[PDB]
């Protein structure tokens, strides 16, 4: 089977429309993969200590931990940019109210392994041969024994471009640490910070081996391989954003003065307080909007920029990413700043490497702590500098840490919204944390597999031994080998169409003569895949 | 079939649990094998005489014998380290009361033969080609015509590591010797030691030939090969150790004084001798523990460090390996000192080669000769220096050879225990000595095949002749060739789970923060496979 | 309950007998008995 092709290339995007308004969005993604021969044929247990970690203030910069570096490379296509292209997104987000994960199947084919012979005859000349017989190692951890490691959050996914080759990344998992950083400091002060790390508590050591946990298929040029057909069990994802806030829930207080002159300038009048009727979660006989009965709490302040410390070290306490307020805050509203790559958007040509861009979901929930505040005992419209905590009050003596930094408003009354899909660098589905009690969602991605997540796809070039034996020695020498093999995946979703219910037209992402540039190549061949808002369709909340 | 893979890699360890508490421990072992082209295409009959052999005292150092060196290489996977890994062992030994050999099957695949062309163009450059057509010779001695030669006892097994390549060893058997060493000496003395050897008595010459006794399969890259499915007939192996000794068998003498104060310090009292009742294998009306009726003899002294001499020369008389006593003796209790290898445990990285470590089974039987003794005629509690042989008495005039060195206590009353499995360097099953009367066990391994043992797997690279003819000449010249071919074996056992019968918890092999290091790679890729106790579950004996 | 199985390479925690604790699982020369508490949930588990 040497001279015959095993699989087929296809990167089409099929949108089947069915009855009652559903759609079978079928995304085909093919891509030419390139794999280099693992440079260290062993399993290494490496630690990581950075000089920066152990300095006054630079604690947040701590990078310590332990790595299990495997000789295997991983093929993760879990990231929107893989499946869709700009146009696709525009369609889906501009018209589907919800979308959900259905089936997924990969397939590796037209494997080609290549030897490289050196010819230092005057100038270093390279000769390329085909080791027809050599093999490509492929492993599929169906049961997820190997620690899960999504690539997406490190833009180490496959190339978001069908006409451009791409590389799978080095597989390496976390191993128990015993990180020490006592005690925290502050930029200036002189103190002796202890900075250590020693492979975790023995009882917590997890040392896995591709070889030991999964059957490995050997693939010669004429061989082929294919995932079965995995079916997701996932809570559908909404592609609509809420807006209403507690100050916009329910029956608006009836007015007594409708304006008499055009312009959003002139407003209407409400009867004085006192004379108003209804419920009150406060005592004063006066019913204000800020102080009014609402169904629940839409949103919540999560102590921002708080660092917690557990065995593995210190770390930022995650915040459910929601849209910022008119006071572009971001960090407290879990905004997510992605960094691009010469392969995940960002002009292929550009001289400077990678790109910035921060992301803010559309669902309005977030807060503006630089505004929030607290008052004492019986409220009292008309504060008491003494009986009122403000967004500019010194907590614990530090003149810039205000109450909001420590304030947590989560409660049974809280109504929250899930992360947003972030085309394209965004992760798509995610394994669920195997803890007795589970999280209501993840920040990583919008889809969490209720059951068992799809399998990790592993790859590694079969060691091409020489005549200089093996064993009875440290690191064995081998023929320089590499591989070019294709890959085709099929991700299938389900979504519902939207419909005209209101009077006014809504948001929709379009082309402006000032952005087409971003969806069109360059006079040289530059291509971008700059991220786009998602969940842009307005939705009632109450 | 050039570009297609023949077999599949799998080194998983399946533990199926069935009814009534049995387990189908199925061990899959795959490994990339590397074979070099036999350097001497003939069958050589070599002798071996060491200078050390013929010197005063250094007799024990005798290495003489005769070798039949074949051009074939052997693939022996008979050794625990092949099949299981540290974790596996911990599980099996920590929970199975017994285990037994069931089925076994090998399979060679993805054969690849390679030519190596020289290019001494300035610096010696190597060019690697594929002799697609050349073949790999494989022979399976199903009926065991070729002399059996387990690799295990010479740590020449396959590599105990799935992610590391390995080499099969040179096959060479013993051939009749007529070793002469008359007469024994002692380090100092001047005497004329005759040291000779001449290929054994003609009537005892056994000259085998792979070619002449077994059909050989030729394998081209696209070929495959597989053992059938051999079934063992073996006495199950206990994974529990006995403890009770003759001084701990049966009904303990009833006491008459139970202690009144806490602490293992204060003991209880037994009525004086005389007044005691029962059997006695002695005359005195006084019944002592040392001199008390017991069911049988648990253990036995085997004349230690005794050297016997038969045709092939002198040699140490084997001792059933049992645990040492509180007087760490070892040698007299057949302890087994294994020597590791850069491929059978022992840090791959370490600068020093190989490792030490001695082994002591758990079943308590062994003795402490430096304690034993003998008394005369009617016993008599209260010796006679004259009527009492002691552990420090000069035998035959030599001031350091005491009676124990010559003492053999084996008898019909002897109750003995079988060798222990020694993970991982330990041999697993073993051929039975074809003598009219058989041994009750072997020391080599714990499993002895009642029927015919599995077949020896032979390998050798098909001679890649050149254009410089052959025959009509001594040693023929040929193209330098070698091979990389995979191998997968499937060893299946049966074992029973343990159960809580007593009150107290028992031994169990665990992780201490002081040993995980041994089950975890190194920051460079070092791996160890240090041996572990086995048979660690306590067992009643009576 | 469900049995455990060898998935990884390394052996794990396990509660055993040390010559320094058997005392706690054995009566006294007078009849003393202890039932000192022991760790539980001692088998390592992946979380992600």
Binding-site residues of A for Mg(2+), in ranges, read 143
How buried is C31 (Cβ within 10 angstroms: 0-12 exposed, 13-18 middle, 19+ buried)? exposed
Contacts 24+ apart (CB under 8 A), A4-8: A4/A222, A5/A109, A5/A110, A6/A109, A6/A110, A6/A111, A6/A222, A6/A223, A6/A224, A7/A107, A7/A108, A7/A109, A7/A110, A7/A224, A7/A486, A7/A488, A8/A109, A8/A488
Contact C47 A204 (CB under 8 A): no
**What is the 3-class SS of A506-527, one letter each residue?**
CCCCCCCCCCHHHHCCCCCCCC
Q: For residue C8, give the nearest of A204, A207, A431 by CB distance.
A: A207
Phi, psi (deg, nearest 5) at residue B203: -55, -15
In this structure, the strands spanning A225-226 and A65-74 are unpaired
Please report, to the nearest 10 degrees, the dihedral formed by the alpha carbons of residues A365, A369, A375, A377 taken in order: 60
For every residue of A25-48, DSSP letters joined together read EEEEEEEEEEEE--S--S-EEEEE
A437 and C CB contact within 8 Å: no
Alpha carbons A339 and A422: distance in angstroms, whole number: 13
Q: For residue C48, give the nearest of A145, A204, A433 by CB distance.
A: A433
Alpha carbons A13 and A24: distance in angstroms, whole number: 10
A203 and B CB contact within 8 Å: yes
Q: For residue A212, give the nearest of B85, B341, B484 by CB distance.
A: B85
- The helix (run of H) or strand (run of E) holding residue A92 is helix A86-95
- Selected for mutation to probe chain C from B21, B22, B29, B88 (highest C CB count within 10 Å) is B88
**What is the 3-class SS of B73-105, one letter each residue?**
EECCCCCHHHHCCHHHHHHHHHHEEEEEEEEEE
Alpha carbons A460 and A477: distance in angstroms, whole number: 16
B490 and A CB contact within 8 Å: no
Contact A409, A297 (CB under 8 A): yes
The label of the residue with tokens 């620690």 reads A147
Contact A199, A205 (CB under 8 A): yes
Alpha carbons A367 and A324: distance in angstroms, whole number: 7
Cα dihedral B62, B66, B71, B73 sign: negative
Contact B103, B229 (CB under 8 A): yes
C13 and A CB contact within 8 Å: yes
Triad A325, A328, A334: Cα angle to 5°: 80
**What is the 3-class SS of B323-389, one letter each residue?**
CCCCCCCCHHHCCEECCCCCCCCCCCCCCCCCCCCEECCCCCCCCCCCCCCEECCCCCCCCCCCCEE
- In chain B, which residues have their Cβ closer than 8 Å to the Cβ of A201? 513
Q: Which residues pair with B44 in a beta bridge?
A: B69
Alpha carbons B123 and B232: distance in angstroms, whole number: 55
Alpha carbons B83 and B99: distance in angstroms, whole number: 14
- In chain A, which residues have their Cβ closer than 8 Å to the Cβ of B32? 462-463, 465
Contact A532, A423 (CB under 8 A): yes
For every residue of A341-404, DSSP letters joined together read -TTSSS-SS-SS-S---EE--SS-----TTT--EE-TT--SS--STTEE-TT--BTTBTT--GG
What token pair was written down for B231? 């079934």
* DSSP three-state, residue A88: helix
How buried is A361 (Cβ within 10 angstroms: 0-12 exposed, 13-18 middle, 19+ buried)? buried
Contact A110, A6 (CB under 8 A): yes
* DSSP three-state, residue A154: helix
Q: Which residues pair with A257 in a beta bridge?
A: A269
Q: Where are the domains of chain B?
A: 1-542
Closest CA–CA distance from residue C15 to any residue of chain B (Å):
7
Pick one of 1.10.3720.10, 3.40.50.800, 1.10.490.10, 2.170.30.10 as the CATH number of A1-542.
Answer: 2.170.30.10
In 3D, which of B231, B227, B213 has the Cα closest to residue B109?
Answer: B227
- In chain C, which residues have their Cβ closer than 8 Å to the Cβ of A431? 48
- In chain B, which residues have their Cβ closer than 8 Å to the Cβ of C12? 87, 90, 510-511
The label of the residue with tokens 């070619």 reads B211
In 3D, which of A242, A243, A251 has the Cα closest to residue A292?
Answer: A251
Contact C8 A434 (CB under 8 A): no
Phi, psi (deg, nearest 5) at residue B336: -120, 115
Please give the span between the terminal C-alpha atoms of chain B, in angstroms, as a whole number: 63
- In chain A, which residues have their Cβ closer than 8 Å to the Cβ of B11? 211-212
In chain B, whose CA is at the least distance from the CA of A222?
B3
In chain C, whose CA is at the least distance from the CA of A437?
C47
* Maximum distance among all Cα pairs of chain A, rounded to whole angstroms: 99
C3 and B CB contact within 8 Å: yes
B167 and A CB contact within 8 Å: yes
Alpha carbons B361 and B324: distance in angstroms, whole number: 8
In 3D, which of A175, A254, A30, A472 has the Cα closest to residue B521?
Answer: A175
Phi, psi (deg, nearest 5) at residue B53: -55, -45
Closest CA–CA distance from residue B406 to any residue of chain C (Å):
35
C27 and A CB contact within 8 Å: no
- Give me the helices (H) in A103-228, please: 210-213
C48 and A CB contact within 8 Å: yes
The label of the residue with tokens 């003899």 reads B297
Closest CA–CA distance from residue A434 to any residue of chain C (Å):
5
Alpha carbons B157 and A29: distance in angstroms, whole number: 46
C5 and A CB contact within 8 Å: no
SS3 content of chain A, % helix, strand, coil (to 5): 10, 25, 65
What token pair was written down for B248? 């701990």
* DSSP three-state, residue A82: helix
Contact C6 B17 (CB under 8 A): no
Contact A472 B519 (CB under 8 A): no
Cβ atoms within 10 Å, residue A110: 19
User: Omega into B276 within 30° of 0, i.e. cis?
Assistant: no
What token pair was written down for B479? 């193209």
Triad B412, B417, B422: Cα angle to 5°: 155
Q: For residue B263, give the nearest of C15, C16, C29 by CB distance.
A: C29
What token pair was written down for C40? 């539980």
* DSSP three-state, residue A204: helix
Contact C10 A148 (CB under 8 A): no
Alpha carbons A328 and A368: distance in angstroms, whole number: 8
Contact A446, A535 (CB under 8 A): no
Contact C8, A212 (CB under 8 A): yes
B25 and A CB contact within 8 Å: no
In this structure, the strands spanning A447-448 and A429-430 are parallel
Q: Which residues pair with A173 in a beta bridge?
A: A68
Please give the span between the terminal C-alpha atoms of chain C, in angstroms, as a whole number: 23
- In chain A, which residues have their Cβ closer than 8 Å to the Cβ of C42? 203
Closest CA–CA distance from residue C34 to any residue of chain A (Å):
26
What token pair was written down for A331? 């960090």
C-alpha distances in Å from residue B169, one per residue of A10, A355, B151, B459 = 49, 57, 8, 9
The label of the residue with tokens 């006491």 reads B255
Cβ atoms within 10 Å, residue A316: 12
Contact A435 C8 (CB under 8 A): no
Residue B380 is assigned to a ligand binding site: no
- The helix (run of H) or strand (run of E) holding residue A310 is strand A307-310
Q: Which residues pair with A68 in a beta bridge?
A: A45, A173
* Reported resolution, Å: 3.5
Alpha carbons B175 and B64: distance in angstroms, whole number: 12
User: Omega into B183 within 30° of 0, i.e. cis?
Assistant: yes
Count CA within 13 A, CB hemisphere, residue B7: 23
Contact A220, A111 (CB under 8 A): yes
Contact B455, B141 (CB under 8 A): yes
Closest CA–CA distance from residue B267 to any residue of chain C (Å):
8
In chain A, whose CA is at the least distance from the CA of B510?
A203
Cβ atoms within 10 Å, residue B160: 27
For every residue of B194-254, DSSP letters joined together read --B-----GGG-----HHHHS-EEEE-TT--EE---EE-----EE-EE----GGGSS-PPP
A with C: how many residue pairs have Cβ under 8 Å apart? 38
The separation between CA B118 and the C-alpha centre of its own chain, rounded to angstroms, equals 43
Contact A267, A255 (CB under 8 A): no
Q: Which residues pair with B426 in a beta bridge?
A: none
Please give the span between the terminal C-alpha atoms of chain A, in angstroms, as a whole number: 63
- Give me the helices (H) in chain C, please: none
Residues in chain C: 48
Contact B410, B433 (CB under 8 A): no
In this structure, the strands spanning B240-241 and B537-538 are parallel
Q: Which residues, 6 or more positions from B276, have their beta carbon under 8 angstroms from its beta carbon? A: B253, B270, B286, B287
- In chain C, which residues have their Cβ closer than 8 Å to the Cβ of A212? 8-9
Q: Which residues, 6 or more positions from B221, have their beta carbon under 8 angstroms from its beta carbon? A: A133, B1, B2, B110, B111, B112, B113, B130, B132
Count CA within 13 A, CB hemisphere, residue B33: 31
Alpha carbons B300 and B333: distance in angstroms, whole number: 10
Phi, psi (deg, nearest 5) at residue B30: -120, 155
Cα dihedral A119, A125, A130, A131 sign: positive
A with B: how many residue pairs have Cβ under 8 Å apart? 164
Phi, psi (deg, nearest 5) at residue B427: -80, 150
Contact A44, B523 (CB under 8 A): yes
In 3D, which of B129, B223, B460 has the Cα closest to residue A467?
Answer: B129
Q: Which residues, 6 or more positions from B471, have their beta carbon under 8 angstroms from its beta carbon? A: none
Q: Which chains touch B (3 or more CB pairs under 8 A)?
A: A, C
In 3D, which of B372, B293, B294, B296 has the Cα closest to residue B332?
Answer: B372
In chain A, whose CA is at the least distance from the CA of C46?
A147
Count CA within 13 A, CB hemisphere, residue B136: 30
Closest CA–CA distance from residue B505 to any residue of chain C (Å):
7
The separation between CA B334 and the C-alpha centre of its own chain, rounded to angstroms, equals 12
Chain B neighbours among A 220-249 (CB < 8 Å)? 220-223
Contact A464 B484 (CB under 8 A): yes
Closest CA–CA distance from residue C5 to any residue of chain A (Å):
11
Alpha carbons A58 and A44: distance in angstroms, whole number: 28
User: Omega into B500 within 30° of 0, i.e. cis?
Assistant: no
**What is the 3-class SS of B150-191, one letter each residue?**
CCHHHCCCCCCCCCCCECCEEEEEECCCCCECCCCCCCCCCC
Alpha carbons B324 and B330: distance in angstroms, whole number: 6
- In chain A, which residues have their Cβ closer than 8 Å to the Cβ of C48? 147-148, 431, 433-434
In chain B, whose CA is at the least distance from the CA of A145?
B12
Task: Specify whether the backbone of A285 is left (phi greater than 0), alpha (psi in -120 to 50) or beta.
Answer: alpha
């Amino acid at each position: 089977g040497v001279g015959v092709s095993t699989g087929t290339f296809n990167n089409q995007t099929e949108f089947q429309y069915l009855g009652e308004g559903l759609v079978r969005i079928t995304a085909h993604a093919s891509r030419l993969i390139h794999l280099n021969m693992p440079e260290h044929e062993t399993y290494k247990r490496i630690h990581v200590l950075n000089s920066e970690s152990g300095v006054a203030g630079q604690m947040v910069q701590d990078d310590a931990h332990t790595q299990m570096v495997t000789p295997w490379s991983l093929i993760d296509a879990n990231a929107w940019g893989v499946w869709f292209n700009p146009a696709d997104w525009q369609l889906i987000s501009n018209n589907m109210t919800e979308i959900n994960l259905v089936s997924f199947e990969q397939e590796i084919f037209n494997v080609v392994l290549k030897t490289i012979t050196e010819s230092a005859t005057s100038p270093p000349t390279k000769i390329y041969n085909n080791d027809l017989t050599a093999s490509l190692m492929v492993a599929l951890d169906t049961n997820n024994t190997l620690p899960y490691t999504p690539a997406a959050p490190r833009s180490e996914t496959l190339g978001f471009y069908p006409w451009l080759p791409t590389k799978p990344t080095q597989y390496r998992y976390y191993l128990s640490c015993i990180r020490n950083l006592n005690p925290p400091t502050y930029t200036g002060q002189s103190q002796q910070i202890t900075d250590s790390i020693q492979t975790g508590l023995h009882s917590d050591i997890m040392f896995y081996t591709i070889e030991n946990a999964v059957p490995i298929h050997l693939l010669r040029t004429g061989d082929e391989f294919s995932t079965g057909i995995y079916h997701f069990d996932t809570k559908p994802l909404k592609l609509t954003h809420s807006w209403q806030t507690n100050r916009s829930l329910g029956l608006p207080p009836k007015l007594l003065t409708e304006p008499t002159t055009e312009g959003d300038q002139h407003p209407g009048t409400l009867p004085a307080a006192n004379t108003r009727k209804g419920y009150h979660q406060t005592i004063n006989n006066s019913y204000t909007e800020a102080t009014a009965i609402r169904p629940a709490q839409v949103g919540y302040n999560t102590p921002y920029m708080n660092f917690e410390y557990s065995n593995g070290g210190p770390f930022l306490t995650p915040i459910v990413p929601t849209a910022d307020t008119q006071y572009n805050d971001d960090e407290p509203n879990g905004a997510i700043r992605f960094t691009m790559d010469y392969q995940h958007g960002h002009l292929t040509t550009s001289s400077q490497e990678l790109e910035r861009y921060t992301f803010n979901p559309q669902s309005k929930c977030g807060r503006a702590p630089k505004q929030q505040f607290n008052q004492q005992a019986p409220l009292n419209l008309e504060n008491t500098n003494n009986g009122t905590l403000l967004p500019s009050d010194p907590i614990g003596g530090k003149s810039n840490m205000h109450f909001m930094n420590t304030l947590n408003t989560y409660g049974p009354l809280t109504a929250l919204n899930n992360t947003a899909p972030v085309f394209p660098n965004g992760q798509i589905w995610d394994k669920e944390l195997d803890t007795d009690l589970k999280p209501r969602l993840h920040v990583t991605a919008p889809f969490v597999c209720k059951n068992n997540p799809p399998g990790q796809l592993f790859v590694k070039i079969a060691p091409n031994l020489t005549d200089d034996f093996n064993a009875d020695s440290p690191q064995q020498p081998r023929i320089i080998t590499y591989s070019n093999f294709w890959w085709k995946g099929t991700l299938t979703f389900t979504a519902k169409m939207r419909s005209s219910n209101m009077w006014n037209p809504i948001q929709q992402h379009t082309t402006t003569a000032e952005n087409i540039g971003n969806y069109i190549p360059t006079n040289i061949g530059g291509i971008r895949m700059f991220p786009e808002y998602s969940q842009l369709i307005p939705r009632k909340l109450y």
